[PDB]
């Protein structure tokens, strides 16, 4: 048995749009955060909720960016998002611009 | 010279002035925006977007005007309205 290409992608969209759990793994995210912060000030500690606040904010930001990126792909008559779609969205948002 | 009450007093009905934003004018704005080719439906779309833009800024400017108990919209009322909508404008005070 094999589901057609796209059937499972659609099932995942529905699954994830129904839940609210963070989607990036906790430890790998915490490591990234600490690494980035070490560039600005060494030897910092983080309250656990500081890291969680950053992850909630980062994931919300990426998810909303993917929604915009998706609109850009569809605008170009595609269903596949590409880097140029992310780039267009960020330029219009004023993030690149 | 300080007498009246209207009297001699004008003010005809204002309507359809969005059409005063002409095709040539919109083409010029698009050109400064770097646009080389424009679909025929762009003009009415642009009028609609400008109307919303103007309604929003003017609504806040007049709210500032009324709060100050004035009957005259000042450049400052517009500047503050623009600022609160994240469209800061330099050159007109403030």
């Amino acid at each position: 048995h094999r589901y057609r290409p796209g059937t499972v992608a659609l099932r995942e969209i529905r699954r994830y749009q129904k839940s609210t759990e963070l989607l990036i793994r906790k430890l790998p995210f915490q490591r990234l955060v600490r690494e980035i912060a070490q560039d600005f000030k060494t030897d910092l500690r983080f309250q656990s909720s500081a890291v969680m606040a950053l992850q909630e904010a980062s994931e919300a930001y990426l998810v909303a960016l993917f929604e915009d990126t998706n609109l850009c792909a569809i605008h170009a008559k595609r269903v596949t998002i590409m880097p140029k779609d992310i780039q267009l969205a960020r330029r219009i948002r004023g993030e690149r611009a | 010279s300080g007498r009246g009450k209207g009297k001699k007093r004008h003010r005809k009905v204002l309507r359809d002035n969005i059409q005063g934003i002409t095709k040539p004018a919109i083409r010029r704005l698009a050109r400064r925006g770097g646009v080389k080719r424009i679909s025929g439906l762009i003009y009415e779309e642009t009028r609609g977007v400008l109307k919303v833009f103007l309604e929003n800024v003017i609504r806040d400017a007049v709210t500032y005007t009324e709060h100050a108990k004035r009957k005259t919209v000042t450049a400052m009322d517009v500047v503050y309205a623009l600022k609160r909508q994240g469209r800061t404008l330099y050159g007109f005070g403030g």
Partner: protein, 109 residues
């Protein structure tokens, strides 16, 4: 302390605290007496609007306890709350179910 200012204003939100916060916020040299009452009333009204909608959302999801998801559902499905909180992120709120039509099975329909 005969009657609290909130009681006199017919409010549940703390008028005195709102007065104190306005004063310590450095918003202005002086704060008139009716300002914290008007503001407390607005804060209470907005809280009631969102709680009403989030409670309805909890109810539609077969739940009796409002969690972040319900506040998100309530705000995002409400045109005006959505606009007021247009640049706000509700933690653990998720997103509204929404799949662009062109992505649905059978070419685009």
């Amino acid at each position: 302390k005969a009657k609290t200012r909130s009681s006199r204003a017919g409010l549940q939100f703390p008028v005195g605290r709102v007065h104190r916060l306005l004063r310590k916020g450095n918003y202005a040299e002086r704060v008139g007496a009716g300002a914290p009452v008007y503001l407390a009333a607005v804060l209470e009204y907005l809280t009631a609007e969102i709680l009403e909608l989030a409670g309805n959302a909890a109810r539609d999801n077969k739940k009796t306890r409002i969690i972040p998801r319900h506040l998100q559902l309530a705000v995002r499905n409400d045109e005006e709350l959505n606009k007021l909180l247009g640049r706000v992120t509700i933690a653990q709120g998720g997103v509204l179910p929404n799949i662009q039509s062109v992505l649905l099975p059978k070419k685009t329909e």
